[PDB]
Amino acid sequence: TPTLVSLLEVIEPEVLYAGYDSSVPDSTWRIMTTLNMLGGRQMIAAVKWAKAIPGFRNLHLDDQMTLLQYSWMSLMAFALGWRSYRQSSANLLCFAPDLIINEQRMTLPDMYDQCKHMLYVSSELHRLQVSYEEYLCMKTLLLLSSVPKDGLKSQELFDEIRMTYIKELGKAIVKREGNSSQNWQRFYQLTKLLDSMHEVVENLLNYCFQTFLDKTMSIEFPEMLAEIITNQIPKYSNGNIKKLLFHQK
Amino acid sequence: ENALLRYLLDKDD
Ligand SMILES: C[C@]12C=CC(=O)C=C1CC[C@@H]1[C@@H]2[C@@H](O)C[C@@]2(C)[C@H]1C[C@H]1O[C@@H](C3CCCCC3)O[C@]12C(=O)CO
Numbered sequence: 268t269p270t271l272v273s274l275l276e277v278i279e280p281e282v283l284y285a286g287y288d289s290s291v292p293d294s295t296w297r298i299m300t301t302l303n304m305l306g307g308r309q310m311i312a313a314v315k316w317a318k319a320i321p322g323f324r325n326l327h328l329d330d331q332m333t334l335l336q337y338s339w340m341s342l343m344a345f346a347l348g349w350r351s352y353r354q355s356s357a358n359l360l361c362f363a364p365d366l367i368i369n370e371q372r373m374t375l376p377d378m379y380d381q382c383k384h385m386l387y388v389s390s391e392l393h394r395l396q397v398s399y400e401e402y403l404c405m406k407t408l409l410l411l412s413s414v415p416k417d418g419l420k421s422q423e424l425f426d427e428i429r430m431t432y433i434k435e436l437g438k439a440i441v442k443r444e445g446n447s448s449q450n451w452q453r454f455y456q457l458t459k460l461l462d463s464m465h466e467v468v469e470n471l472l473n474y475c476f477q478t479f480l481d482k483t484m485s486i487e488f489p490e491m492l493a494e495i496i497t498n499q500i501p502k503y504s505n506g507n508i509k510k511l512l513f514h515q516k
Numbered sequence: 517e518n519a520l521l522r523y524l525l526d527k528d529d
Binding site for chain 2: 314318331332336491494495
């Protein structure tokens with residue numbers, strides 16, 4: 268019987284290419300548009316991924332939809348942080364192998380302020396020397412990081428699935444073979460990074476929502492993203508979102 | 517409505 272972490276590993280989506288032509292000069296508008304198109308394709312792959320996470324398909328179909336719609340930005344920004352961590356280590360934002368925010372791209376107007384919340388994710392993964400097994404558990408936990416204020420239809424099963432992956436994160440940490448005290452510290456550090464993703468996402472969604480809503484910017488989103496964005500905007504407005512935390516404020 | 521996400525979740529794969 269395979270281990271649960273090996274099952275999470277085998278379903279990890281293959282890295283997608285942006286289809287960005289390097290022979291054409293850069294513009295922030297061109298990069299934003301290309302990234303929205305890439306994001307749509309990454310979200311189609313994220314649906315196929317979530318369906319293969321052991322336990323996910325046992326939740327009510329409405330809960331499956333709810334979790335993907337709440338967590339979509341957290342999943343993209345976290346996987347982006349991982350790719351940036353593995354690829355550069357310098358570091359740069361590595362959206363796709365053909366679309367990296369290199370030093371020349373960083374000179375675009377206000378580029379650092381547009382990238383710093385995402386660069387923080389990769390910087391922390393690097394600082395904490397997060398492993399591939401820890402990362403797989405952490406990303407699954409991000410899919411399970413927000414619920415409606417009144418809860419899910421399959422709340423008991425969701426809590427059991429969530430606890431299972433918290434314990435899986437524990438197993439990955441123990442492999443770093445530190446003492447009981449070092450394991451507790453590492454669990455605290457990794458779960459603090461998980462909590463900080465809610466704050467990273469609020470910044471990214473402020474940008475995403477502004478560019479989606481302001482039609483005078485001529486910033487296109489593919490159907491996959493436009494559908495999730497259209498669904499999420501009223502939920503943020505009416506406070507129908509419970510952000511789950513490992514550490515109380 | 518969320519037609520596309522529902523379909524991706526309902527279809528095989
Ligand atoms: C999902 C997204 C796509 C691919 C990926 O790997 C990771 C992500 C997570 C962040 C997602 C990204 C894209 O949509 C584009 C988004 C949605 C972005 C957050 C916003 O930030 C800006 C910046 C990103 C740095 C380069 C300049 C533009 O682009 C966004 C936007 O609002 C554009 O309208």
